[PDB]
Amino acid sequence: SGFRKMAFPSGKVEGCMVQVTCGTTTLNGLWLDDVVYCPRHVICTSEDMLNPNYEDLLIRKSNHNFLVQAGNVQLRVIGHSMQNCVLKLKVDTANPKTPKYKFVRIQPGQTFSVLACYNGSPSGVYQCAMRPNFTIKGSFLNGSCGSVGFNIDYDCVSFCYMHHMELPTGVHAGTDLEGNFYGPFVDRQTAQAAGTDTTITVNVLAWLYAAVINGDRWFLNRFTTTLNDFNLVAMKYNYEPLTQDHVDILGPLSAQTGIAVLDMCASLKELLQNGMNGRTILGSALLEDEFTPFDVVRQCSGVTF
Amino acid sequence: SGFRKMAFPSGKVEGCMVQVTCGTTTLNGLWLDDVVYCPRHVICTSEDMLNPNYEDLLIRKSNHNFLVQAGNVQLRVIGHSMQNCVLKLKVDTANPKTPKYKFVRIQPGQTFSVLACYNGSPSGVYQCAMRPNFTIKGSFLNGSCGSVGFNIDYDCVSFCYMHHMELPTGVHAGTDLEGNFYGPFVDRQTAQAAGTDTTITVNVLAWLYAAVINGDRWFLNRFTTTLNDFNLVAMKYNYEPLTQDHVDILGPLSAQTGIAVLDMCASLKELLQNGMNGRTILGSALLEDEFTPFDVVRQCSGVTFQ
Numbered sequence A: 001s002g003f004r005k006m007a008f009p010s011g012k013v014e015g016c017m018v019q020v021t022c023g024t025t026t027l028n029g030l031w032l033d034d035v036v037y038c039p040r041h042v043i044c045t046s047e048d049m050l051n052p053n054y055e056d057l058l059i060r061k062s063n064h065n066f067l068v069q070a071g072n073v074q075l076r077v078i079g080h081s082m083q084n085c086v087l088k089l090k091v092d093t094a095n096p097k098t099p100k101y102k103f104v105r106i107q108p109g110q111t112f113s114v115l116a117c118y119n120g121s122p123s124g125v126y127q128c129a130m131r132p133n134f135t136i137k138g139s140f141l142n143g144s145c146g147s148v149g150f151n152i153d154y155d156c157v158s159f160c161y162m163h164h165m166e167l168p169t170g171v172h173a174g175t176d177l178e179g180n181f182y183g184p185f186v187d188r189q190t191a192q193a194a195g196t197d198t199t200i201t202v203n204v205l206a207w208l209y210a211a212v213i214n215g216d217r218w219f220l221n222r223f224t225t226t227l228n229d230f231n232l233v234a235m236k237y238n239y240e241p242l243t244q245d246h247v248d249i250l251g252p253l254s255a256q257t258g259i260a261v262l263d264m265c266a267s268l269k270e271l272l273q274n275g276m277n278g279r280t281i282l283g284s285a286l287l288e289d290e291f292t293p294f295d296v297v298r299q300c301s302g303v304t305f
Numbered sequence B: 001s002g003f004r005k006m007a008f009p010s011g012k013v014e015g016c017m018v019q020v021t022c023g024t025t026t027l028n029g030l031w032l033d034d035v036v037y038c039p040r041h042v043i044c045t046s047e048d049m050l051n052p053n054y055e056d057l058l059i060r061k062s063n064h065n066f067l068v069q070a071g072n073v074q075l076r077v078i079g080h081s082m083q084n085c086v087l088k089l090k091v092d093t094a095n096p097k098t099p100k101y102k103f104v105r106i107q108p109g110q111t112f113s114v115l116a117c118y119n120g121s122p123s124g125v126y127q128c129a130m131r132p133n134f135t136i137k138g139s140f141l142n143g144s145c146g147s148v149g150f151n152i153d154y155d156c157v158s159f160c161y162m163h164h165m166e167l168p169t170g171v172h173a174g175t176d177l178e179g180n181f182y183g184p185f186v187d188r189q190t191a192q193a194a195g196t197d198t199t200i201t202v203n204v205l206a207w208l209y210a211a212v213i214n215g216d217r218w219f220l221n222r223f224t225t226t227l228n229d230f231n232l233v234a235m236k237y238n239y240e241p242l243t244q245d246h247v248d249i250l251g252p253l254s255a256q257t258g259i260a261v262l263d264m265c266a267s268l269k270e271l272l273q274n275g276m277n278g279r280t281i282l283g284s285a286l287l288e289d290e291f292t293p294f295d296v297v298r299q300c301s302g303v304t305f306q
């Protein structure tokens, strides 16, 4: 037993991370087959970022203006191109450790593992969720751009995020691996800001189910609630309303624990109205909302990769 | 910015995980050079586990009683021996994916990454801290024995934990890779339980520094204190004592915030004596003690402070 914020094994992704240098700027890139992907602002100087013309900036670059290092090995760049907000560098060597992979655009509420990298070298791995306001609450310092986020779907690495910048309020913005931003953000210096965030209700309920599975159930009560009555309480605490799709997604966890979903909702409602009374749930002194129902089943059943 | 519980990348350790089978039992082993390490209770039966004579049980077993599988490859066992509570199986093949490594024994308060494995294959990776009562609070299911904990420094893996069992309160017990149990737990069926735990003071201070760096500053007061006075407070509230070495290790965090270490101690003292008044710190309604000073420096200092 036990339940932890668990990242995917990162080995398959570590073998893909390289260092990309253009001018004075060094960041991270993703080496798959004979292409290296990285944020296109690597070609900008601090002056360009106020109002860049990326096409014009890229026409002035040559292949030899890009220095790509896989560990200590220099990779010869032989072509460069733009796709949306991503730069694609074609190299003369196919990554021999390219895993089975695909590129996926995820939705708010879905989780993934982030491999935080600096200078092409992986430093740490942690779980994140795509927030309702299309940001992520990660941990990133200068030099982290190009760090990627991913899931493992059976035998396939599903890349879903590449880091591009931190917004002034401390949250992080990036693109899918097609180069399109999540949310309304742009890779230039403007007056952009994230909208107000909300708590992912269905994920909190899944984590409460995880607690019951692992023998932590002090928060269960004898009350009932309707869906409509729960949602009015939820919306007052800046939780997102629970839809019938959300209720259905929690079916399997409800069946395994024997706790009806609306009975869990009545327990959550009292946690919101009265606090946790100095108690923890699964070691946490807060209501965790970055486990999906699928994350719970994956961890509690010991799926391997 | 941002502050998250972060594990080390697991790849160097994934390439070392194998499946070990003895009789009807299957668990995980660690394959380094030509040796496989795993918990010695793999040789036991349910009845043995009441009063196991491991020396006699090991003599009974022969090399061919152990099946070791690395992916789809069977490794031939050519010798076996015991070191404390770990079994060492000599195999006829050295692991080609052996990283640079060492075996280390950690102290309470130190953190490490755990790669939870089943049947020789990885499920996921998360961070753990050695509690003062020599347990850890992990995520381990049936079949997880032999999963290892580790730290990585540049290219060197320091293995510090091997998983052996779960205790009655849902916490976890294991050994270092020399087979020496953390704490007084034993690999036999016994009415054992984790003692009362305490809070790791230097880690709480590291975490309060991380909060300040990430803009959560309401708990800071105008007071200072001394190491001696603060340790009287720590003792009353079931906190570990704080040493001068701890003060030195917190230096980089004091420099990035401009808050002296003993000034932070006085702010923690006020939280312990007066409570948090329902406020959160980094989202948490209770003080967190599973981040070391090194863990916070790794996420917050960058090139500016060392």
Ligand SMILES: *O=C(*)(*)(*)(C1(*)(*)(*)=C(*)(*)N(*)(*)=C(*)(*)C(*)(*)(*)(Br*)=C1(*)*)N1(*)(*)(*)C(*)(*)[C@@](*)(*)N(*)(*)(C(*)(*)(C2(*)(*)=[C@@](*)(*)[C]=[C@](*)(*)C(*)=C2*)C2(*)(*)(*)=C(*)C(*)=C(*)(*)(Cl*)[C@](*)(*)=[C@]2(*)*)[C](*)[C@@]1(*)*
Pocket: A041, A042, A044, A045, A046, A049, A140, A141, A142, A143, A144, A145, A164, A165, A166, A186, A187, A188, A189, A190, B001
């Ligand atoms: O480094 C970095 C970072 C990330 N994350 C977090 C942090 Br604290 C930091 N980065 C890099 C830089 N960027 C910028 C630039 C770019 C290029 C050039 C110059 C500058 C930006 C980006 C994007 C936008 Cl939209 C703006 C700005 C930042 C991030």
Ligand SMILES: *O=C(*)(*)(*)(C1(*)(*)(*)=C(*)(*)N(*)(*)=C(*)(*)C(*)(*)(*)(Br*)=C1(*)*)N1(*)(*)(*)C(*)(*)[C@](*)(*)N(*)(*)(C(*)(*)(C2(*)(*)=[C@](*)(*)[C@@](*)(*)=C(*)(*)(*)[C@@](*)(*)=[C@]2(*)*)C2(*)(*)(*)=C(*)(*)[C@@](*)(*)=C(Cl*)C(*)=C2*)[C@@](*)(*)[C@@]1(*)*
Pocket: A001, B041, B042, B043, B044, B045, B046, B047, B049, B140, B141, B142, B143, B144, B145, B164, B165, B166, B186, B187, B188, B189, B190
């Ligand atoms: O699997 C397992 C586990 C781990 N962790 C968590 C869980 Br839920 C589960 N395991 C295996 C088994 N074991 C036992 C013991 C140990 C130590 C002490 C006592 C008991 C056994 C072993 C061997 C035999 Cl033959 C039987 C039993 C636990 C852990």
